[PDB]
Amino acid sequence: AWMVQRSLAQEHGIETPKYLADLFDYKTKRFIEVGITKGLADDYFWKKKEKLGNSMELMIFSYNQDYSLSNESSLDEEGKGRVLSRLTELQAELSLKNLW
Amino acid sequence: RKPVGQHSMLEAMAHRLRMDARLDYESGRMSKDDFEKAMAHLGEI
Amino acid sequence: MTLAKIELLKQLLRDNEAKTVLKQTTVDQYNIIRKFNTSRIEKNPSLRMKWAMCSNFPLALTKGDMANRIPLEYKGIQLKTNAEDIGTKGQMCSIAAVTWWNTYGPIGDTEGFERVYESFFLRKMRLDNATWGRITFGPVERVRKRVLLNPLTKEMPPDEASNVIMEILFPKEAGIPRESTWIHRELIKEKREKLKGTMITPIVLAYMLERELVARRRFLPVAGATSAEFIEMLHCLQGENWRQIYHPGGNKLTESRSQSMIVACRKIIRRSIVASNPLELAVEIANKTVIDTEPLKSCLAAIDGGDVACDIIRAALGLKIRQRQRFGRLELKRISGRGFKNDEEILIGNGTIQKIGIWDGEEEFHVRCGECRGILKKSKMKLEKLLINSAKKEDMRDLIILCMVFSQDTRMFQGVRGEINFLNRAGQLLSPMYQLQRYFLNRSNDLFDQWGYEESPKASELHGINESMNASDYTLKGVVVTRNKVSITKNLSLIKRTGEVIMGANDVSELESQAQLMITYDTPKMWEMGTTKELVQNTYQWVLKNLVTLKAQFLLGKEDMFQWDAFEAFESIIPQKMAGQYSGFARAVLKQMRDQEVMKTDQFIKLLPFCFSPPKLRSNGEPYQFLKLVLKGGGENFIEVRKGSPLFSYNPQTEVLTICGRMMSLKGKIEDEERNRSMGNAVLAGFLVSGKYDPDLGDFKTIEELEKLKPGEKANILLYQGKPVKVVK
RNA sequence: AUCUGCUUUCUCA
RNA sequence: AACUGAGAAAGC
Ligand SMILES: *O[C@H]1[C@@H](O)[C@H](n2cnc3c(N)ncnc32)O[C@@H]1COP(=O)(O)OP(=O)(O)OP(=O)(O)OC[C@H]1O[C@@H](n2c[n+](C)c3c(=O)[nH]c(N)nc32)[C@H](O)[C@@H]1O
Numbered sequence A: 001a002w003m004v005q006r007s008l009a010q011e012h013g014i015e016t017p018k019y020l021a022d023l024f025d026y027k028t029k030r031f032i033e034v035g036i037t038k039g040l041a042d043d044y045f046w047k048k049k050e051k052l053g054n055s056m057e058l059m060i061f062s063y064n065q066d067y068s069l070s071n072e073s074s075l076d077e078e079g080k081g082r083v084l085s086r087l088t089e090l091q092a093e094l095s096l097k098n099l100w
Numbered sequence B: 001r002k003p004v005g006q007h008s009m010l011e012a013m014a015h016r017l018r019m020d021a022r023l024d025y026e027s028g029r030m031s032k033d034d035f036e037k038a039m040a041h042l043g044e045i
Numbered sequence C: 001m002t003l004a005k006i007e008l009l010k011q012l013l014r015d016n017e018a019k020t021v022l023k024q025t026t027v028d029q030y031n032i033i034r035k036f037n038t039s040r041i042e043k044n045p046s047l048r049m050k051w052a053m054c055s056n057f058p059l060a061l062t063k064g065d066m067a068n069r070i071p072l073e074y075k076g077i078q079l080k081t082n083a084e085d086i087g088t089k090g091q092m093c094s095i096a097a098v099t100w101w102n103t104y105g106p107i108g109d110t111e112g113f114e115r116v117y118e119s120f121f122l123r124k125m126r127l128d129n130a131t132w133g134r135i136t137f138g139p140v141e142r143v144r145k146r147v148l149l150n151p152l153t154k155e156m157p158p159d160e161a162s163n164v165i166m167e168i169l170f171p172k173e174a175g176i177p178r179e180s181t182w183i184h185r186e187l188i189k190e191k192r193e194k195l196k197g198t199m200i201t202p203i204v205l206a207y208m209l210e211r212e213l214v215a216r217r218r219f220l221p222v223a224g225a226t227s228a229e230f231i232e233m234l235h236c237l238q239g240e241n242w243r244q245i246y247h248p249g250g251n252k253l254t255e256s257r258s259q260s261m262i263v264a265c266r267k268i269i270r271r272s273i274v275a276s277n278p279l280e281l282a283v284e285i286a287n288k289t290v291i292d293t294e295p296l297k298s299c300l301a302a303i304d305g306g307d308v309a310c311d312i313i314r315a316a317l318g319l320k321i322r323q324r325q326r327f328g329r330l331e332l333k334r335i336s337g338r339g340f341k342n343d344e345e346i347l348i349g350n351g352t353i354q355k356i357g358i359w360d361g362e363e364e365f366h367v368r369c370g371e372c373r374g375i376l377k378k379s380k381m382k383l384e385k386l387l388i389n390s391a392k393k394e395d396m397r398d399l400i401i402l403c404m405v406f407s408q409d410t411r412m413f414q415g416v417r418g419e420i421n422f423l424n425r426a427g428q429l430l431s432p433m434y435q436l437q438r439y440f441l442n443r444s445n446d447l448f449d450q451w452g453y454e455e456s457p458k459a460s461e462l463h464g465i466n467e468s469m470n471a472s473d474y475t476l477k478g479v480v481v482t483r484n485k486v487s488i489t490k491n492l493s494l495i496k497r498t499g500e501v502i503m504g505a506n507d508v509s510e511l512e513s514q515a516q517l518m519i520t521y522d523t524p525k526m527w528e529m530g531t532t533k534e535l536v537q538n539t540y541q542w543v544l545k546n547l548v549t550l551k552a553q554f555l556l557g558k559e560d561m562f563q564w565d566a567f568e569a570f571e572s573i574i575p576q577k578m579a580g581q582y583s584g585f586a587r588a589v590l591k592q593m594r595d596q597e598v599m600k601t602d603q604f605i606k607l608l609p610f611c612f613s614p615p616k617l618r619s620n621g622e623p624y625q626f627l628k629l630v631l632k633g634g635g636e637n638f639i640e641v642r643k644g645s646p647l648f649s650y651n652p653q654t655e656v657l658t659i660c661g662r663m664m665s666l667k668g669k670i671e672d673e674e675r676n677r678s679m680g681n682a683v684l685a686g687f688l689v690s691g692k693y694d695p696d697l698g699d700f701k702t703i704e705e706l707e708k709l710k711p712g713e714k715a716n717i718l719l720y721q722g723k724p725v726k727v728v729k
Numbered sequence D: 001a002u003c004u005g006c007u008u009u010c011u012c013a
Numbered sequence E: 001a002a003c004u005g006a007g008a009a010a011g012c
């Protein structure tokens, strides 16, 4: 993972993000982080920013349909809706089985 | 520097070569047909 | 060649054994299979080389066009083996092939050699642009110290250097970006751009970089010069009996100049204090002292720093006193104060009792560190106040930590909870304060935890700060933040015009440390600034050379033979407390030998140097009594009155005097009756021999008992093992 | 105030 | 069928 991150950073000439990210976007030529929470998405987004701030874009998804993306809207709402539906399905199944 | 990792040498080599091929293609070092050959070889690997 | 590498990987995976090796072996286990070797390596490479050189083709060629340029045979000499066994065999060549390549082979480019071995080229430049002084033959006391082998311009810890090398040469597979990757970003980028146009092997470049960066420190015997530029020539600098003056080329850091200047000033003062009119001798020596290649006066003028000794020498030489101190990253200037250093069994937080150097009295210092300034007021083991100015967070933290350590606050000592070593693996004494500073620079959390916090100042300008380096509501106890000519006495005492002593010779640190640079003394009596063993050997050699005249004067003269320059220099290594007692004891013994017919020449030589200081007899008017006269420096530097000593032993059988390991001969300066003469009359002051071991008297009486005897009272004295005698007052 | 990557050779144990 | 530990040196 670190090899991929450093290779992409060198190729695109962007300073290496100090922490291992989740994905790298060629179109944006940047990094994308994914933090899956269960409460407010904005609070977890701010918590992530307090340590990262401007290192890379942040995407936050919550099982309660609450989300928080970066300042740039790139993905269409279809994928966001699909991800939210998948998370809601997982949460509902876990709660039904008393696993939540 | 000694390379660390609990994963197979083949896995590390394949991922490194895939990243190198993708960077070469994006930067234009490698031709599109050469990139296709590299991707096919890696897939069969 | 990503596509070619992928094709090679597919080709290798076409082999089942290689396929399973790659699949099963992990990345960590690669390091194991890299060392796989079915056949054990031979263990006599010298014999193997002598055997192979007497063969046809011991060398192995590298397949390619360059190997093809080598002719099969040259003038009937088969350079390389025939190529009829190409199939999975390999190729070989003779050393004659190497010579042929060096003679007629293609002319390549040397830029790679210049780049890779730039360190050795700099070493050669330092050697060539260097001047040699004169070789001096005489005793040299070398101390084993951990010194840097080669000079460096940016020395970094090995892990930091390894990370820098990985960033420079392997940016992609470098791992996590660490602190080093940031604090050395400029150097990493500069090296990457410089190494961009290079086809040299990456591993060779990495070793070049580590040679340029990593510091190789080894334990070596050094004598007055420990700078790496001197360590690389140590083999020529000096031995156990000779010393070559050497002036290395290249630029020298001013830190080494300051350290060598401090050492030189301390030596000058230590040699001058015992002299009559110490100021005159101190000035005379300082005017003929050279630090590496510059006079001491110029170094003192041009160095904005030093210690008490440097200030004293500056005042003696006419330069202004720069009352500045260095405590690592911290630089201080004594605004005002006064304190006498003492050794205190300080209890450390982790239950360790150490004889740490503690200062007493109110003292104020204009302190600075990095880009931050402040004023530190302190007392005995307490930080009275610390008013710091606004600056960078890291610089402010460094200043606060260093001031805490400097103040020797009791909380600071109690704040040590961890592994702290005040003694090196060789048993040499590390500076306790500097070790505490090093510990607290990194593990600073506990120091602030135990320091305590009080209410932040509410004054007009004073606002306090906390561990976050922000103006928090609570401040560190005793710490506040704000946004806003001498004369020297004969005895080397610095006095203001008012009449107050500000610094004195007694305030000079007694530590005897090797100079960073080579200190030279361009005076005939340059050995008088040497170590204890060197001084002892030189003084006794002077006594031996002038033994005839010294003895004649002693038999004829009464008191004029006890005053000499050599003995004055020898006095500088006798502690002041015991100097007078030693003088009284030795003078009494020599006079008792002279007045009677008992004249042990070896004892006369042994005790004569100690008869220089003014006698300090006991309260009853009788001289003290000693078994060993302990000299300054080291536990083995002492003279045994009766037995032999590491610094002075006598062999009557061969009449050979072993002083500091050097054997002189008294054959020629001796009386054959001396061997029969009893040693008991040259051991105790005011004691003569009367007979053999007398059982009636009792057991051997010690020094305390012997001093309390009355006149005409016999006692048993053990001159040495197996030699008891009976002595009287 | 200097202490806080391996292989081979030689010495020592 | 050339081991263990330590030290120094050299090479990668
Ligand atoms: O290399 C040694 C010494 O020569 C060197 N040193 C000392 N001073 C300087 C300067 N000014 N420039 C460059 N190098 C310098 O550092 C090593 C110190 O060894 P040593 O001589 O043993 O130091 P000392 O015996 O003086 O005790 P130490 O705690 O190390 O202090 C050295 C220096 O700092 C002064 N100092 C320390 N403390 C805690 C002091 C204090 O509480 N109060 C006062 N007035 N001074 C304090 C020492 O007096 C020296 O000035």
Ligand SMILES: [Mg+2]
Residues within 6 Å of the ligand: A020, A021, A022
């Ligand atoms: Mg993660």
